[PDB]
Amino acid sequence: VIPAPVGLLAELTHRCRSAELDTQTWLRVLTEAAGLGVLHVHLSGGEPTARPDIVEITAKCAELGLYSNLITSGVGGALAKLDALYDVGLDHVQLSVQGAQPQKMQFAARVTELGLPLTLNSVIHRGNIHEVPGFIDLAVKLGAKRLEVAHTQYYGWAYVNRAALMPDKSQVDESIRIVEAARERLKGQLVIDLVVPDYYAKYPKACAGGWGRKLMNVTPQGKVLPCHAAETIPGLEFWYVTDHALGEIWTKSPAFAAYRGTSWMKEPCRSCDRREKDWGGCRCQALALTGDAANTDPACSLSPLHAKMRDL
Template identity: 50%
Template structure:
């Protein structure tokens, strides 16, 4: 997610841990799960939606208009690859007309220069392009698309040519982490204003491929040193955000700004989710924009209420002085690693499973990485080409 703000004016906090939500800060619109790339770290669910199940142009425009009326500030067009939707221009214009700041999160294919220029004219305000490495062969191997790296480089240059702000998302892991310094240099050369050094987070396809991606603690320590040095060196030139693997953290990340507090996602078929991985929690039922308004879902959906605020928390979270800072961490990760979404996020050092998870990750990282299981609708591939 791009352009997160520290503005908390959209949320009223009461003293008993419950919350009355006026409006979220941002909406992530997952327009499609279709994508020419087959990234094995993709955060999309393992069961990907086909084109026939996607919301129509009219349905998306209805959602966008409702978001504007609710007071949502930002819309982030994502996927899959959002540019495979031929109606992207219509949705960007609708967002601009509705007063929403719009950001395109793209892997860089199949978009072209003329289309980027048109999107900018229609009101698109920012573009984020993901990169898998600086070395073309390895980048294409990771992304599962021959020629993909060169296309990403071209798209990044086009973004700057049409005078749109550019963020580079450097997806880092054990198979490219030794090139982090070169990735930072590449972001500078491409004219990016912001760089996300995002270590793979283990949800969806990334969880399935964790053993192929998890870095060693020593690799992570070196990466952290590189980022800290670059931040000092490039202050005022390039903003660098840095996300480490949860498995090596001491405290959980503030996932999505807190469950149901600041962000919402809409998947390709119209289900509204508190986060992109929320469907992995089987006990939750999600409401659809085909049946309810966006505002109704935000305020009334049982899925959003399930872990909103602090009243749901067990110990040690309930007594923790950080509970209204990290909001209990990631519920999807708690479910994936403990089998219960209410449990303390194992990324937290207060979790009884924290050391076990750390040790498991460190042991996996010592072994030779297995072949990738590539992201593909309806299939699993062990060869990218």
């Protein structure tokens, strides 16, 4: 009844202090993740290249057949370690291009020069959503294979830093025409991935496929979260990889079990057809916008607080 995980977000550090895990503990987590069935491993955190053992960690992903994605800013010593990371079998690179930046270009040019698939990532909001054409030209200029533009904080999970920062319905309708025209314009050259607030949807989307249903986030100290923003929710018992095997955390840790399945649900989700399709929406949005994480996501039209959130 409990599904196998597919992705793993490894926050290796918060650097750009001394409480970070040892190399051997990360190598164990990667091994246990492959044993559970994880496919993708996102090497990130603050700056994953700041780790001295970043090459050995990347090599273990290749040794275990895990698809490694280096989520990095591309600044500082990131370019120095790129050649070694390529040699050990780094599968993919994701450069957050939010726009000093000259050295991001040198890192990006070297990634494509080695033949690695590059993905520019950028966070868009009401202020900088007019910059989407500039991001499209940059991705083509650098020769990236993919371009991500998302109003959410972390791609995959549906959570925002603030509500007033979100873009207009007019801006979303505008950013569809820009992205769709550029998709046809660059069918084979670039892949464009847009994530924006759905102002026409009556029902919400499953956040990361559902709580405790796909992804794991592992903090630098070894704390395992069902999502990046899960520490927002109070009363959750997170387990550490230093005290349990990853499989026991995925299946038995109270933080993962808390909002997994449908037994936790309040109305209207508890008596709803779509309860096992979107899983009540996003827990963190519910908490951040209603005060209780077990509430229905206000993004849903059946939420009683949808009338207030829509006016905001």
